[PDB]
Design a protein around this ligand. Structure first.
Ligand SMILES: Nc1nc2c(ncn2[C@@H]2O[C@H](COP(=O)(O)OP(=O)(O)OP(=O)(O)O)[C@@H](O)[C@H]2O)c(=O)[nH]1
Ligand SMILES: Nc1ncnc2c1ncn2[C@@H]1O[C@H](COP(=O)(O)OP(=O)(O)CP(=O)(O)O)[C@@H](O)[C@H]1O
Ligand SMILES: Nc1nc2c(ncn2[C@@H]2O[C@H](COP(=O)(O)OP(=O)(O)O)[C@@H](O)[C@H]2O)c(=O)[nH]1
Ligand SMILES: [Ca+2]
Ligand SMILES: [Ca+2]
Ligand SMILES: [Mg+2]
Ligand SMILES: [Mg+2]
Lengths: 429, 308, 53, 419
């Protein structure tokens, strides 16, 4: 098989991990103790779900995952929660003192203390894989651990596993739920240091998710639990072809342009008693609708380099092709000249899954689109502007310098983002 | 109170909207780079559309439509006419035009040149309609407000920007008799003030001199061009469903030929207004485009849902 | 609109739809990290020297 | 995790005692150390301030024994660790130099032994909070000597103070501006976060708003304890924002020296209708609700923390907090985006259903330092009362340095207000 190891870093990475691993278990019929009655090959197996779950002799399906945080609060909940029997204690790694919303404490000061330990625990999981494909790394841009420790870990992973793909799920910072004025700084520092180490990154803007929950789920004031459950559906659709039977050289034709825009439809509330069921055409259309995107930007004013669609549920290729045809002769889907104008399509017949007592209705059919569009640079421009405002006054910079960074890392990280913005602009205008 | 910022110090029109807003007592002007605004009156070059609609607790509105420059550059306008099936190569009210690059067959280059030899090369309208007295050329400027709902509002007042020189078939080198630009005129001011003849007079001239009306003979066509151009780009520029809203004021420029046919010459993204009409139009920009979105007629609404 | 690479199985299927044709070594990391430690150590010593005064 | 609390001098120990009364009640700890509450939220982060029935992690310091008897016999006096009472016999006589250099120097190593003991059994000590006045001798002079020593032993831990700033309206002595200026000098170099609790403000609230024609220290301290309860809510209960001292510092302090906060509280009391979320929000930002006597409209907010306590709509809080920034946007610096953070804790304080606490880093805090600086110079320029300080070994020059550093602090605040 082609195993994938998931690394969940910091509060955001861990709590999203809880949502994803809960969802995978429900999709695969794995109980919270790790038992999976449907799996008739005890002790091992070569099945698709084995990409994400190893097996013990006792019939137990164990995530190929490490959870890392510099303080124990969030992971202690995993250790005592409903999925505690699912993870071996050594997959759940904590320090005692966090990065205090400071990339530099994450990366340099606290980070150095726990890195060798984490790499060893990753190595244990890597040693259980007959043909490891790579890593999925979940983290916030804005936290000190999510930013600072993640960038340290990615550097080390290139050294220790150079031949291996590293994908990120990265939470971009939104003022309605953010906890630190310095999140722009942390976001640029981590983006800079990770750029050359990451093959593909899926950004989820907390603002986009927050608004989707308000607008489509009728949730007045969304919690992380609300946000993370929706995120987990996107994550599930993105990893589904790995975990089930089916079929970055699709999405990443330029090394640095590796941030595809995710869009998901339909998001419909559980409390909606009477819900009319959306067709293939309607859900495909919703994919080109800015309000369903994981990052709010306007794809009409950029260009496409690739689209991948994964449909889940009652979907046949004929309706997909018909919907796609009509899409071209209605929207502004301009591709770059050096790419084909076309869509990679996966269909998984299993209807999408919902966590019982969640907010998402269980629909007959859903779609997730990943499109590499220059429009996502809108998100960099916004973040870069905030960074400039504070950095001009050197506001908060002493917190970083006191941990051992130089000002130079700031301006060097910022100039890489200026270059990144330049790159996106050339491909898209 | 509502808040706005001001990013075009040079804008005649939105200099007047800012003044009108402030004298309401319900609009405060913030500093240029303060993001907590309801309304941006934007810069014309590189307006930061990607930073709009990310301020929780603020409905944000800007006075430009991202993407409308397709209509408002000569290069891109020709490409749009030619490649949109709504308009097409057969489109009967744009002059035959060609995009070309550096490094009676009478044409014009767009500093402008007019010849029968050889950034856009366009068929020069010989046989324009000439006002009398003075055997003289003009163009018509119509001002169009497209609001956040994509309502297309044509301001009922427009203006003829006239020539003051007899028109000359056999001498295309001399301008002023051929080019009707207010600047590039300034025998100026002879027949009407500032070479501006407004609609009451021109309608009267068309009645007295041609036995028709401005409405029948010119405006149906003006109205048709404007809705055709703007309903064409609507899917690309509309802000329905988007996380900020746009409006924009356009200047549409028309030639009328001697057979009282109308031709589209140019669309203008950042137009100025004629002195007399500043107050009226600028008020209507507040009434229809701003206070509609942020609550406290002189426009014709262009709409025509025909059945086939 | 050309539908290529059609793969089918029981739990799903996949295809393409064409509408139209067209690192630092471990030593560098440990170095970087150690230089930051050295700068924090210096800063700390500088403060303790001043507090000794 | 753990905070080590230190209270010094008369003022330090009176407001400190009140702090422990108020928070013990909020956490359901009675005066014998036992727990009797009905919410697991009260015990979840109990260890931040209490050792394990629950003993405060509190050290009580004075050069004068008077105050330490009256705390020991006060309501919660039973609850303190008896070995954590450390006291001299001599007093400091409202003299900074006595506290800092002569008499306090004698006592301080004993205090440090108690600190070291409490620290050594912390799972992961975050740092220290001190309560003290800056106008007297022990709290001011010895308290700042402590801070300096604590920094030498714990250079990487956060030092937080609640510093009661003096005013002629509630005045024990003319040398108060001397003592305060000498202490501000220390605080600027040696703390990470200082809450400026201004007796000028407290008096003015009691007199103008609460209608008390002669405010006692009890009345002033009733405001101080509500404020201390409020600003430490994010440390004591579960929550995302500013949940520890370092994270607060990182959110509140854009430049190391500008760490003097203007606290605010609503509703002001000494209560038959709960306030609406709009009224709390308007009031908490009002000049009349600030515990430092500065007009925030004479400056700009660098950073703001707002903590809401009680059962209320979190939507309404978010809407009202957005409302006040949007309508007063010029009073928030434009070069620090999203500089206002908001927490909401369910558990209200005693006797209120709804409350708001404000923590502002405003450039208008310069008004406070200027007032002290004016009173200082008036006396120092005639060398008045100096001989009480030179008689303890100090040099004039040391006063000159202190006045200088404070006038510098004012300039910087002004620089960022014009930026
Ligand atoms: N979507 C989502 N965002 C989160 C979650 N937890 C935190 N965030 C966001 O992530 C950022 C804060 O980073 P965290 O992940 O909490 O920080 P951390 O990695 O634990 O880092 P330190 O606490 O600084 O060591 C802010 O933008 C939060 O809104 C979560 O569960 N889901
Ligand atoms: N094909 C054509 N036939 C006749 N006259 C033409 C023409 N093209 C341009 N003109 C003349 O040139 C003048 C200005 O041309 P054009 O509209 O291309 O330039 P411009 O962009 O300066 C006008 P504006 O200042 O409103 O933007 C018109 O008023 C018209 O008289
Ligand atoms: N708010 C308040 N201020 C006090 C209290 N006790 C003293 N003060 C003030 O503190 C200063 C005197 O300091 P004090 O603590 O008595 O001196 P110390 O014992 O030498 O530390 C003066 O400015 C007084 O107004 C108190 O309980 N509350
Ligand atoms: Ca098996
Ligand atoms: Ca002695
Ligand atoms: Mg954390
Ligand atoms: Mg006293």
């Amino acid at each position: 098989m082609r195993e994938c190891i998931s690394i969940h870093v910091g509060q955001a990475g861990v709590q999203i991990g809880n949502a994803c691993w809960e969802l995978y278990c429900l999709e695969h019929g794995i109980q919270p103790d790790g038992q999976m009655p449907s799996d008739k090959t005890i002790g091992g197996g070569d099945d698709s779900f084995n990409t994400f779950f190893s097996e013990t002799g006792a019939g137990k399906h164990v995530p190929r995952a490490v959870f890392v945080d510099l303080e124990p609060t969030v992971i202690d909940e995993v250790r005592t929660g409903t999925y505690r029997q699912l993870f071996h204690p050594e997959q759940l790694i904590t320090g005692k003192e966090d990065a205090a919303n400071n990339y530099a404490r994450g990366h340099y000061t606290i980070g150095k203390e726990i890195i060798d330990l984490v790499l060893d625990r990753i190595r244990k999981l890597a040693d259980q894989c007959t043909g490891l494909q790579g890593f999925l790394v979940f983290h916030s841009f804005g936290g000190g651990t999510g930013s600072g420790f993640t960038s340290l870990l990615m550097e080390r992973l290139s050294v220790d596993y150079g031949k291996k793909s590293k994908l990120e799920f990265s939470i971009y910072p939104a003022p309605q739920v953010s906890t630190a004025v310095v999140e722009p700084y942390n976001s640029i520092l981590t983006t800079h240091t990770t750029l050359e180490h990451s093959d593909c990154a899926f950004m989820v803007d907390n603002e986009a998710i927050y608004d989707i929950c308000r607008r489509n789920l009728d949730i007045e004031r969304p919690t992380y639990t609300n946000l993370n459950r929706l995120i987990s559906q996107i994550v599930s659709s993105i990893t589904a072809s790995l975990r089930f039977d089916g079929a970055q050289t699709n999405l990443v034709p330029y090394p640095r342009i590796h941030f595809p825009l995710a869009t998901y439809a339909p998001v419909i509330s559980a409390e909606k008693a009477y819900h009319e069921q959306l067709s293939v055409a309607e859900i495909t259309n919703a994919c080109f609708e800015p309000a369903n995107q994981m990052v709010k930007c306007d794809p009409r004013h950029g260009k496409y380099m690739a689209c991948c669609l994964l449909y889940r549920g009652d979907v046949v290729p004929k309706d997909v092709n018909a919907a796609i045809a009509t899409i071209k002769t209605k929207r502004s889907i301009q591709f770059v000249d050096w790419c084909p104008t076309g869509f990679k399509v996966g269909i998984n017949y299993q209807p999408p899954t919902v966590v019982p007592g969640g907010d998402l209705a269980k629909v007959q059919r859903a779609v997730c689109m990943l499109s590499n569009t220059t429009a996502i640079a809108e998100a960099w421009a916004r973040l870069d502007h905030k960074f400039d405002l504070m950095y001009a006054k050197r506001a908060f910079v002493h917190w970083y310098v006191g941990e051992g960074m130089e000002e130079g890392e700031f301006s060097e990280a910022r100039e890489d983002m200026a270059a990144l913005e330049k790159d996106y602009e050339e491909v898209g205008v | 109170m509502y808040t706005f910022v001001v990013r075009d110090e040079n804008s005649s029109v939105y200099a007047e909207v800012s003044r009108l807003l402030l004298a309401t007592g319900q609009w405060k002007r913030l500093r240029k780079d303060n993001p907590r605004f309801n309304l941006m009156l934007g810069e014309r070059n590189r307006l930061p559309f990607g930073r709009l609609g990310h301020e929780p607790g603020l409905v944000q509105l800007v006075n430009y439509y991202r993407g409308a420059d397709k209509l408002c550059r000569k290069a891109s306008l020709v490409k749009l006419i030619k490649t949109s099936p709504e308009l097409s190569e057969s489109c009967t009210w744009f002059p035959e035009s060609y995009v070309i690059y550096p490094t009676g067959n009478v044409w014009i280059a767009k500093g402008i040149l007019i010849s029968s030899e050889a950034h856009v090369i366009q068929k020069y309208l010989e046989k324009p309609l000439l006002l009398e007295p003075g055997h003289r050329k003009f163009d018509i400027r119509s001002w169009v407000l497209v609001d956040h709902l994509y309502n297309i509002y044509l301001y009922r007042e427009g203006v003829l920007r006239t020539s003051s020189e007899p028109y000359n078939s056999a001498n295309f080198q001399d301008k002023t008799c051929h080019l009707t630009n207010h600047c590039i005129q300034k025998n100026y001011g002879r027949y009407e003030e500032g070479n501006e003849m407004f609609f009451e007079e021109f309608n009267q001239y068309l009645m007295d001199a041609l036995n028709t009306t401005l409405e029948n003979s010119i405006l149906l066509q003006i109205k048709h061009i404007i809705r055709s151009c703007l309903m064409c780009i609507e899917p690309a520029i509309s802000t329905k469903h988007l996380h900020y809203q746009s409006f924009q004021l356009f200047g549409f420029d028309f030639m009328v030929d001697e057979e009282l046919k109308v031709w589209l010459i140019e669309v203008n993204g950042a137009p100025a207004c004629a002195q007399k009409l500043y107050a009226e139009l600028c008020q209507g920009i507040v009434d229809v485009a701003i206070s509609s979105v942020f609550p406290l007629s002189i426009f014709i609404k262009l709409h025509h849902h025909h059945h086939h | 609109m050309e539908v290529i690479e059609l793969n089918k199985c029981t739990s799903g299927q996949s295809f393409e739809v064409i509408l139209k044709p067209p690192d630092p070594s471990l030593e560098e990391i440990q170095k970087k990290l150690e230089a930051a430690e050295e700068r924090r150590k210096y800063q700390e010593a500088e403060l303790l020297k001043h507090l000794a005064e | 995790r753990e905070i080590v609390h230190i209270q010094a001098g008369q003022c330090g120990n009176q407001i400190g005692a009140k702090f422990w009364e108020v928070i013990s009640d909020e956490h359901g700890i009675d005066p014998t150390g036992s727990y009797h509450g009905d919410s697991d939220l009260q015990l979840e982060r109990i260890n931040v301030y209490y050792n394990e029935k629950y003993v405060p992690r509190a050290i009580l310091v004075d050069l004068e024994p008077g105050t330490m008897d009256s705390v020991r016999s006060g309501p919660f006096g039973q609850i303190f660790r008896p070995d954590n009472f450390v006291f001299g016999q001599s007093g400091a006589g409202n003299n900074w130099a006595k506290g800092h250099y002569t008499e306090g120097a004698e006592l301080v190593d004993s205090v440090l032994d108690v600190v070291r003991k409490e620290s050594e059994s912390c799972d992961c000590l975050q740092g220290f909070q001190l309560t003290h006045s800056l106008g007297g001798g022990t709290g001011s002079g010895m308290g700042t000597l402590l801070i300096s020593k604590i920094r030498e032993e714990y250079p990487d831990r956060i030092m937080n103070t609640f510093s009661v700033v003096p005013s002629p309206k509630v005045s024990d002595t003319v040398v108060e501006p001397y003592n305060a200026t000498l202490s501000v000098h220390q605080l600027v170099e040696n703390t990470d976060e200082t809450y400026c609790i201004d007796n000028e403000a407290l008096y003015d609230i009691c007199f103008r708003t609460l209608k008390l024609t002669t405010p006692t220290y009890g009345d002033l301290n009733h405001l101080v304890s509500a404020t201390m309860s409020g600003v430490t809510t994010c440390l004591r209960f579960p929550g995302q924002l500013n949940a520890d001292l370092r994270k607060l510092a990182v959110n509140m302090v854009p430049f190391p020296r500008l760490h003097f906060f203007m606290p605010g509280f609503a509703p002001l009391t000494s209560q038959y209708r709960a306030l609406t979320v709009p009224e709390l929000t308007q009031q908490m930002f009002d000049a009349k609700n600030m515990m430092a006597a500065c007009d925030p409209r004479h400056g700009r907010y660098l950073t703001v923390a707002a903590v809401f306590r009680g059962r209320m709509s979190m939507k309404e809080v978010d809407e009202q907090m957005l409302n006040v920034q949007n309508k007063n946007s010029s009073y928030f610096v434009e070069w620090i985006p999203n500089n206002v953070k908001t927490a909401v804790c369910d558990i209200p304080p005693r006797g209120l259903k709804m409350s708001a606490t404000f923590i502002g880093n405003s450039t208008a805090i310069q008004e406070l330092f200027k007032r002290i600086s004016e009173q200082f110079t008036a006396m120092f320029r005639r060398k008045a009362f100096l001989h009480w300080y030179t008689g303890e070994g100090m040099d004039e020059m040391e006063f000159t340095e202190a006045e200088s550093n404070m006038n510098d602090l004012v300039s910087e605040y002004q620089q960022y207000q014009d930026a």
